[PDB]
Structure 1
Amino acid sequence: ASRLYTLVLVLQPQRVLLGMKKRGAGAGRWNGFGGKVQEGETIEDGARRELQEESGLTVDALHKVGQIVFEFVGEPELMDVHVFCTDSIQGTPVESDEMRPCWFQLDQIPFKDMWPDDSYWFPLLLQKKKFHGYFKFQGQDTILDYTLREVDTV
């Protein structure tokens, strides 16, 4: 029914790292770093692995910040996205064929060039709030309906 994904935001006091995907799901959009969780792999281990694969960064300890379930009408599998944040990383962001990373000042987060759901839950992430969300999409751009509530335990 649902498929596990990870999403990692490198969020520091005055800036956040995003990556511009070159192809595939989310191409042409700034997003965090993540992907599918593998068999026998913890969600958190999958989040660390994907951060390195896509951005070249090594994270020390991830913090759970949210869970967002995505529905795309006409697609059978729900996307169960486990969202993490970190402020302590190692390495320098690496641009590859697949991904172009860039730091953004918090007052210049490029929401018009991001998935539209980000405009709803990023304000919570920036104020250190935890959340459970659900977004029903039609295509890649239209949110048909959604729920989003703050939680004390992800």
Structure 2
Amino acid sequence: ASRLYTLVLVLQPQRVLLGMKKRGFGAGRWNGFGGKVQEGETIEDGARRELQEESGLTVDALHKVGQIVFEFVGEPELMDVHVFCTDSIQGTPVESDEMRPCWFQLDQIPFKDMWPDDSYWFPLLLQKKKFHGYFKFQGQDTILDYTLREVDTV
């Protein structure tokens, strides 16, 4: 079985917003905003909730840009991450207990301090291409297997 997660990338024409994860899973890496989808909310509502909780931001619209499935060796549950993009933020980003937000120019994206899979699929996001991904991890550092392709419908 898989568990539903969200990931939101605030992508403007010359910069992208990332958050430094301060605690919990993936702490110490820059990432998009998101988390587990809860009972009683749609996937998109979950993505909005997490963006709000983690950055203080609300948005007009969220666009579906990809799905990535993660397997971690030894872990029963797969992560089914629904990836969204926006360029219509409302408010100014503010630090939360979970995330410290910062803007990065698109040629200074800090891949060495991000999840290793981002190096593979960010280019597709940046090129406004819809994708499906699968990544098999050994721990949090080592990609054993992956697949990646462009799709018409996410």
Q: Which string of whole-angstrom CA distances, capped at 9 and with x for unpartnered residues, describes residues 57-97 of structure 1?
A: 00111000000000000000000000000000111111123
Other structure's SS at 2:8 match: strand
TM-superposed CA distance for 1:26, in Å, is: 0.9
Q: Within 1, Cα distance between the matches of 2:6 and 2:30?
A: 15
Shift of 1:135: 0.1
Instruction: Quote how far apart the aligned CAs of 1:35 are.
Output: 0.5
Matches within 5 A, 1:46-61: 46-61=46-61
State the identity as a percent. Answer: 99
After superposition, the C-alpha distances for 1:80-139 in whole angstroms (9 at most, x for unaligned) are 000000000111111123211000000000000000000000000000000000000000
2:17 touches 2:104 (CA, 8 Å); kept in 1?
A: yes
Instruction: Give distance in 1, aligned partners of 2:55 and 2:104.
Output: 15
Contact 2:16/2:105 (8 A) holds in 1: yes
Query: Which structure 1 residue ranges, 5 or more long, are not aligned?
Result: none
- The runs of 4+ residues in structure 1 deviating greater than 3 Å are none
Q: How many residues align?
A: 154
Matches within 5 A, 1:65-80: 65-80=65-80
Deviations 1:32-72 (CA, angstroms, capped at 9, x unpaired): 00001111210001111100000110011100000000000
Q: Is the 8 A contact 2:15 2:105 kept in 1?
A: yes
Q: 1:89 to 1:120 in 2, by over 3 A?
A: same
Once residues 61 and 93 of structure 2 are traced to their aligned partners in structure 1, the CA distance between those partners, rounded to angstroms, is: 18
TM-score, normalization by structure 1: 0.99
User: Partners in 2 of 1:98 and 1:50 — Cα distance?
Assistant: 10
* Contact 2:18 2:104 (8 Å CA) reproduced: yes
CA contact (8 A) 2:53 2:96 kept: no
Give the unaligned 5+ runs of structure 2: none
Q: Which whole-Å CA distance do the structure 2 matches of 1:98 and 1:83 have between them?
A: 19
Partner SS, residue 85 of structure 2: strand
